[PDB]
């Protein structure tokens, strides 16, 4: 692991504080601007949608990426949530109430066993079965997110290959002729400190760069900084143009 404090300039530029962690898969080398915060464990918030999706698929709670989960008719503050969703759009718009129903159907015993099998964070699901990743006991650091994502990339988690392929499809965020980004955002607001997350990886022709970032996020107005700061780091390190 190497520390590169120069990336702090990207946070300071936006009056922010946080951490970016990168992992060069070919060379098995990690880089970060803050080795302490890189290993600080936070609520995963919606980044938990990655393991939750895997478990739901593997237990048949979700049949496939086309199955429709009908809106329950309750109007919520995020407009995109007030409609029917499949796994692809529920990941895209981070639709909490769809995933809350998954978790209830999964149930606490199976949720706990799967997170242990995944070696996920502190493996603690204390709290409500349908909100613990938002206001319960589960904590994961940026470097632990990378360990988890690497197993997913390699199809090494303790679920079927199909489940892992479908979730990686549903993580698709950006692609062009230079790179592919598979990732998931998160925003933890229920418990302090409020933080934003972005975790995933960048696929190149001949390498994969895993990343996990979090940043202090006192208001929703800075959420776009999650991707913008990560991309400034990726550009500085010549991973993306
Ligand atoms: C949409 C979100 C994002 O882009 O990060 C966010 O995901 B969750 O952490 C989450 C939970 C409740 C409300 C919003 C969110």
Swiss-Prot record:
EC number in record: 3.5.2.6
Q: Which residues form the active site?
A: 46 (acyl-ester intermediate)
How does this polypeptide assemble, per the annotation? Answer: Monomer. Dimer.
Give the GO biological process terms.
Answer: antibiotic catabolic process; cell wall organization; response to antibiotic
- Role summary: Class D beta-lactamase which confers resistance to the beta-lactam antibiotics, including amoxicillin, and moderate resistance to cephalosporins and carbapenems such as cephalothin and imipenem; in the DH10B strain of E.coli. Acts via hydrolysis of the beta-lactam ring. Has oxacillin-, cephalothin- and imipenem-hydrolyzing activities.
The record's Pfam families line, in alphabetical order, gives:
Transpeptidase
* UniProt activity-regulation remark: Inhibited by avibactam, related diazabicyclooctane (DBO) derivatives and by bicyclic boronic acids, via a covalent binding to Ser-46. Inhibited by chloride, bromide and iodide ions. Not inhibited by the beta-lactamase-blocking agents, clavulanic acid or tazobactam.
What gene is it encoded by?
A: OXA-48
Q: Which residues carry this modification: N6-carboxylysine?
A: 49
User: Under the GO molecular function aspect, what terms does this record hold?
Assistant: beta-lactamase activity; penicillin binding
Modification after translation: Carboxylated on the epsilon-amino group of a lysine, with the resulting carbamate functional group serving as a general base. Probably N-carboxylated at Lys-49 at neutral pH in vivo and undergoes complete N-decarboxylation, at pH 4.1, in vitro.
Its domain of life reads Bacteria
Please verify whether the record's keywords include Translocase.
no
What UniProt keywords apply to this chain's record, in alphabetical order?
Answer: Antibiotic resistance, Hydrolase, Plasmid, Signal
Task: Tell me what reaction this enzyme catalyses.
Answer: a beta-lactam + H2O = a substituted beta-amino acid
- Effect of mutating residue 46 to G: Increases thermal stability. Abolishes hydrolysis of cephalothin and decreases catalytic efficiency about 60-fold with respect to ampicillin
Factors inducing expression: Expressed from an upstream promoter, P(out), in an insertion sequence IS1999.
**What protein family does this chain belong to?**
Belongs to the class-D beta-lactamase family.
Q: Which organism is it from?
A: Klebsiella pneumoniae
Q: What is this protein called?
A: Beta-lactamase OXA-48
Q: Name one GO cellular component term.
A: plasma membrane
Top enzyme class: hydrolase
Give the note.
When OXA-48 is present in clinical isolates of K.pneumoniae, increasing chloride concentration during antibiotic treatment reduces bacterial growth.
Q: Which residues bind a beta-lactam?
A: 46, 49, 94, 226
